[PDB]
């Protein structure tokens, strides 16, 4: 008997603004009359759980328990118990959920790199990389904002938060986007946006364009003569 | 600036626009949508001074050397095969102006609508379908004009020089 | 007897993320132990607000009621009733307040103006202007950020939205920050951040620098002889 | 029974080259024959207060008393009394009003800022900002001038005086104007004019065109 108690992830918290936590029990017979309720640290009642799993053919009753917990309630540090009760087994099973407090929140830094000009000679494509590093804890959320409209995730990939051995147990990641050069040389900011808890407003922005790596001046000298 | 990439071949796919479950299901993509000539598509220029006096300028490079691309239908000897190529592309411009194309193109964005409503700011002759059709007679006429800039294989036959723009 | 059920301002809502609605019932006759609380339109009572203001020095009594609600609950669109009961009130008063949903939305545009070049000549200071325009509706919130740490509110001045006449109902505003030039011509990104509902993520920011321009030069030195 | 006494303003004085002043009586019964007049400290008689406002539909009377005195007397700081007497107000209400004598003066400083670069690159319209700062007292006037022709007032927006926290008694104000992108690409005059009492001639102006802040790009040198 395994009970998945998924809390609202910070990425989902920011994306939805309507944080929901799920609680479902597996390894059970496909039998009806299943109660999946939630209680606070003081055992206060919760809003009703809807969309319970049916008698699924997978030989398990994955009765999901959805609760519309407020953001302030979850971030207050209180732990909540998923009370699961079944007709066949009258004993409810206790699962307490809360944030893993501890390490302080360090503000990350995000650096955006223009494509290499030695790439921009073959006239085929270009690459944009925004790399975030130096943050605790993990689970940051990044995406792209272009010319005022968001982009679907399938045109770029991201990296899972890996620890950096040089520093203490901090984390880093990087987002990579591939865009052809013909449009790249005509404006096309392709701004990169990052969201993490430690930020004062939990949103930070980075931008690049043509006018990011232009040379400063020239010292051309011509001494045409026959001396 | 580039006139063409590799010609007709089995490379049409669906993952270019992934999650194509937007209207019915996933669909391939023709080369015409992949490679097509435009000049002002970024929001950099955004709007224009007076009107769209330069689409005809753009399509001048569409077949003068873009479809020429090395007389590929001269060695192929199938000039009518070239004719259908411009026929398909010309009908593509019909859908681009009318907001009918299904691609998530830069031109698919408001830039098409944003310009036309600006010129129709007072809603004077909101027939953006008809005025494009009104422009079609001259739009097609200048379409073969750059075809003559290509190697002088000019045929004055009405089939290859006058399409019934009224029907589609 | 003046009753005001102040709706939570969007700027404070974003700043605190702990929206708190207030009810001010003043000009009442001097009478202690009043019955002040906040409820829903259906009567959902709130926590008993503490630190009640004493009787006003103007021979009246002050009644302050502060209540904490979830941001989504306030954004749902219900009506909040301040329940006030005083000796001079023959019946309890239910001050009903709700936000006016149904307004138009328009994303703003943000620009930053570097200080005038001849302003940077008398050696006192310089001014930087963050201009926001075209937003709808009003009540935008702006501030200044420096290398990740915010600056004192005393160091910048923010105007208030006004309806521009060049187009239909829209607003604009400008914030002015004064900075000594002697360290301005050193770096000091001095970024400006804005927040409004119409934004895709409710947050936007831009930045400038001493070197935010000055295109490529040329030093041709032809010596043909 | 409200009695306002509107003092002359610097902008009104500049526009009219006069010193019109008025006394308004509102929130009274819809009854005529209201004893409204203007007097000096010596109680001199002013000309007739023409165009008495008709009783408003909101059951509030409106009486206007207009007075015309030379500019020096108003600038002299002498208080002028609006004599108001009514059946509802038997006591003669006094409205002794004068300019705030005893205020320091500082020279305003003016700047013009060209429109933002990327806004011009976006190619819809350009915005010109005329900034004025470091002046005392308040009540300054602003206007826009284009190749010798004045512009309609609604095409530009002026701000209000605001005390900055750094300077104790100084102020600052803004002016915003918008034009089309291509017409500013022509960029002919677009000058901004400001009027304030501290100026030697009470008038100053500045100009800015399409190519003003553009720096040189070719330091070409030749030698034989």
d(CA A6, CA B100) in angstroms, rounded, equals 43
B5 in contact with A, Cβ within 8 Å:
no
Picking from D71, D75, D82, D72, the residue whose alpha carbon sits closest to that of residue D6 is D82
- Beta strand C141-146 pairing with C149-150: antiparallel
The 10 Å Cβ neighbour count of residue A168 is 10
Resolution (Å units): 3.6
**Integer Cα distance of B146 and D130 in angstroms:** 51
Instruction: Collect all residues of chain D within an 8 Å Cβ-Cβ radius of residue B45.
Output: 123
Closest CA to C8 of C86, C85, C93, C68: C68
In chain A, the N- to C-terminal Cα span, in Å, equals 95
Cα separation, B44 vs D178, whole angstroms: 20
Coil/strand/helix, residue C98: coil
What is the 8-class DSSP label of residue C13?
H
Task: Identify any residues that bridge with C127 across adjacent strands, giving them in sequence order.
Answer: C178
Strand runs labelled E in chain C = 2-6, 20-28, 35-40, 55-56, 60-68, 80-85, 93-97, 109-113, 126-135, 141-146, 149-150, 156-158, 162-163, 171-179, 191-195, 204-206
Against chain A, the chains showing at least 3 CB pairs within 8 Å are B, C
Q: Which of helix, strand or coil describes residue D22?
A: strand
Task: Name the token pair of C82.
Answer: 């301040």
Distance from the Cα of D135 to chain C's closest Cα (Å) equals 16
Residue of chain C whose alpha carbon sits nearest to that of D126: C111
- C contacts of A217 (beta carbons < 8 Å): 216-219
CA dihedral sign of residues B45, B47, B53, B58: positive
Nearest one of D146, D127, D121 to D207, comparing CA atoms: D146
Pairing of strands A191-195, A141-146: antiparallel
Characterize the bridge pairing of strands A156-158 and C2-6.
unpaired
Is residue C56 within 8 A of residue C32, CB to CB? The reply is: no
B-interface mutation test, from A147, A178, A179, A191, most B Cβ less than 10 A away? A147
List of residues 6+ apart from D179 with CB closer than 8 A: D125, D126, D128, D190
The rounded Cα D222 to chain-centroid distance in angstroms is 56
CA nearest to B90, candidates B141, B47, B39: B141
Tokens 């980075």: give the residue: A206
User: Which token pair is D117?
Assistant: 């670069």
What residue in A sits closest to B1 (Cα-Cα)? A182
Chain breaks in chain A (C to N over 2.5 A) after: none
Nearest chain A residue to C223 by CA distance is: A223
Q: Are D50 and D67 in contact (CB under 8 A)?
A: no
Side-chain-side CA neighbours of residue A211 (13 Å):
9
Task: Determine the 3-state secondary structure of C4 from DSSP.
Answer: strand
Which residue of B lies nearest to D117 if distances are taken between CA atoms? B44
A21/B48 Cα distance (integer angstroms): 51
Closest CA to D68 of D89, D92, D50: D50
Gyration radius from chain A CA atoms? 26
CB A197 within 8 A of CB A141: no
Alpha carbons C177 and C190: distance in angstroms, whole number? 9
- CB of C80 closer than 8 Å to CB of C39: yes
Helix (H, G, I), strand (E, B) or coil at B32: helix
Q: For strands C141-146 and C191-195, give the pairing.
A: antiparallel
Contact across the interface for C72 and A214, Cβ inside 8 Å: no
**3-state SS assignment for residue B93:** helix
3-state secondary structure of C71: helix
Sheet holding D2-6, edge to edge: D2-6, D20-26, D62-68
**Residues in contact with A90: Cβ distance below 8 Å, sequence separation at least 6, in sequence order:** none
Contact D164 C178 (CB under 8 A): yes
CA distances, C153 to each of B15, B19, B106, C144, C177 (Å):
50, 47, 42, 9, 10
Q: How far apart are CA A189 and CA A179, in angstroms?
A: 11
Encoded tokens for C198: 């119409």
The C-alpha atoms of residue C140 and residue C109 are separated, in whole angstroms, by 12
How big is chain B by its Cα radius of gyration, in Å?
Answer: 17
- Strand partners for D130: D112, D175
Q: Which two tokens stand for residue B73?
A: 């239908």
Angstrom distance (rounded) from CA B33 to CA B89: 9
Return the percent helix, strand and coil in chain A, to nearest 5. Answer: 10, 35, 60
CA atoms within a 13 Å half-sphere pointing along the CA-CB vector of D184:
22
The answer to whether residues D164 and D170 touch, using CB atoms and an 8 Å cutoff, is yes
- Residues C129/C173, Cβ–Cβ less than 8 Å: no
Set of chain A residues whose Cβ sits within 8 Å of the Cβ of C145? 200
DSSP alpha helices (H): ranges in C36-184? Answer: 71-76, 181-184
Report d(CA B147, CA B134) in Å as an integer.
22
Burial class (CB in 10 A: 0-12, 13-18, 19+), D102: exposed
Residue whose entry in the numeric block shows the structure tokens 């005392």: D136
Cβ(A40)–Cβ(A64) below 8 Å = no
Residues of A in contact with C224 (CB under 8 A): 222-225
Alpha carbons within 13 angstroms on the beta-carbon side of residue A194 total: 29
For chain D, the distance separating the N- and C-terminal CA atoms, rounded to the nearest angstrom, is 91
Reading the block at residue C141, the tokens are 């919130």
Q: Which chains touch B (3 or more CB pairs under 8 A)?
A: A, D
- A30's CB contacts (< 8 A; 6+ apart) are A55, A56, A59, A60, A61
Return all residues near A143 (Cβ < 8 A) that are at least 6 apart.
Answer: A150, A151, A153, A175, A192, A193
Q: Which residues of A touch B (CB under 8 A)?
A: 123, 147-149, 152, 154, 182-183, 186-188
Alpha carbons within 13 angstroms on the beta-carbon side of residue B22 total 12
**Is C223 close to A222, i.e. CB distance below 8 A?**
yes
Element (H, E) at A143: strand A141-146
Round to whole Å and give the CA distance between A126 and D189.
44
How far apart CA D129 and CA D117 sit, in angstroms, is 14
- Which residue from B minimizes the CA distance to D180? B49
Q: What is the DSSP letter of B73?
A: H
Residues of B in contact with D122 (CB under 8 A): 43-44, 46
State the CB neighbour count (10 A cutoff) for residue D132. Answer: 23
CA distances from B137 to B24, B82, B103, B141, C49 (A): 34, 20, 26, 6, 76
Residue D152: exposure state from Cβ atoms within 10 A (0-12, 13-18, ≥19):
exposed
CB contact under 8 A, A218 and C217: yes
CB contact set of B139 (below 8 Å; sequence gap of 6+): B55, B56, B59, B93
- Asked if residues A171 and A138 have their Cβ atoms less than 8 Å apart, the reply is yes
Partners of D193 in the β-ladder: D143, D205
Return contacts of B24-32, CB within 8 angstroms, 24+ apart. B27/B102, B29/B103, B30/B88, B31/B5, B31/B7, B32/B85, B32/B88, B32/B89, B32/B92
Nearest to C61 by CA among C36, C94, C80: C36
CA terminus-to-terminus distance, chain C: 95
Whether the Cβ atoms of residue B110 and residue B139 lie closer than 8 Å to each other: no
Query: Quick check: helix, strand or coil at residue C215?
Result: coil
Burial class for B131, CB neighbours closer than 10 Å (0-12, 13-18, 19+): middle
Judged by DSSP in three states, B152 sits in coil
Which residue shows structure tokens 């859908």? B95
d(CA D144, CA D129): 11
User: In B, which residues are within 8 Å of D120 by CB distance?
Assistant: none
What H or E segment, with its residue span, contains residue D204? strand D204-206
Diameter of chain B measured on Cα atoms: 52
CA distances from A25 to A22, A39, A54, A68 (A): 10, 16, 13, 19
Tokens of D101: 């004598």
Beta bridge partners of D44: none
Nearest-angstrom CA–CA distance, A52 and A62: 8
Strands in D191-195's sheet, in edge-to-edge order, are D149-150, D141-146, D191-195, D204-206
What number of other Cβ atoms are within 10 A of residue D50's Cβ?
Answer: 7
- Please, are residues D191 and D145 in contact by the beta-carbon 8 Å criterion? yes
Q: Cα dihedral angle (C150, C156, C158, C164), rounded to 10 degrees? A: -110
Residues of chain C with C-beta less than 8 angstroms from the C-beta of A71: 70-71
Angle between helices B55-63 and B79-98 (to 10 degrees): 160
């Amino acid at each position: 008997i395994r009970v998945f108690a998924i809390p609202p992830s910070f990425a989902s918290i920011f994306l939805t603004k309507s944080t929901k936590l799920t609680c479902l029990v597996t390894d059970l017979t496909t039998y009806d009359s299943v109660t999946i309720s939630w209680t606070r640290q003081n055992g206060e009642a919760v809003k009703t759980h809807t969309n319970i799993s049916e008698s699924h053919p997978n030989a398990t009753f994955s009765a999901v328990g959805e609760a519309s917990i407020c953001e302030d309630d979850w971030n207050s540090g209180e732990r909540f118990t998923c009370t699961v009760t079944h007709t066949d087994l009258p004993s409810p099973l206790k699962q307490t959920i809360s944030r893993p407090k501890g390490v302080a929140l360090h503000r990350p830094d995000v650096y955006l790199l223009p494509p290499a000009r030695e790439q921009l000679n073959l006239r085929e494509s270009a690459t944009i990389t925004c790399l975030v590093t130096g943050f605790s804890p993990a689970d940051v959320f990044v995406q792209w904002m272009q010319r005022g409209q968001p982009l679907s995730p399938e045109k770029y990939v991201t990296s899972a938060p890996m620890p950096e051995p040089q520093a203490p147990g901090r984390y880093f990641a990087h987002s990579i986007l591939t865009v052809s050069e013909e449009e790249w040389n005509t404006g096309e900011t392709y701004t990169c946006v990052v969201a993490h808890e430690a930020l004062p407003n939990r949103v930070t922005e980075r931008t690049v364009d043509k006018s990011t790596g232009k040379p400063t001046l020239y010292n051309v000298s011509l001494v045409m003569s026959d001396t | 600036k580039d006139k063409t990439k590799l010609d007709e071949l089995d490379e049409w796919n669906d993952m270019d626009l992934r999650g194509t479950y937007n209207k019915h299901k996933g669909v391939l993509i023709p080369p015409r949508r992949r490679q097509l000539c435009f000049s002002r598509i970024v929001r950099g220029p955004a709007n224009l001074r007076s009107l769209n006096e330069f689409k005809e300028e753009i399509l001048k490079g569409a077949q003068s050397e873009g479809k020429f691309l090395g007389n590929y239908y001269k060695e192929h000897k199938d000039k009518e095969k070239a004719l259908e190529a411009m026929k398909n592309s010309f009908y593509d411009y019909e859908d681009i102006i009318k907001g009918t194309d299904m691609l998530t193109n830069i031109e698919f964005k408001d830039i098409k609508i944003k310009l036309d409503r600006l010129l129709e700011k007072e809603t004077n002759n909101t027939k953006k379908a008809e005025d494009w059709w009104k422009t079609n007679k001259k739009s097609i006429w200048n379409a073969m004009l750059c075809g003559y800039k290509k190697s002088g294989n000019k045929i004055i036959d009405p089939s290859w020089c006058t399409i019934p723009t009224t029907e589609t």
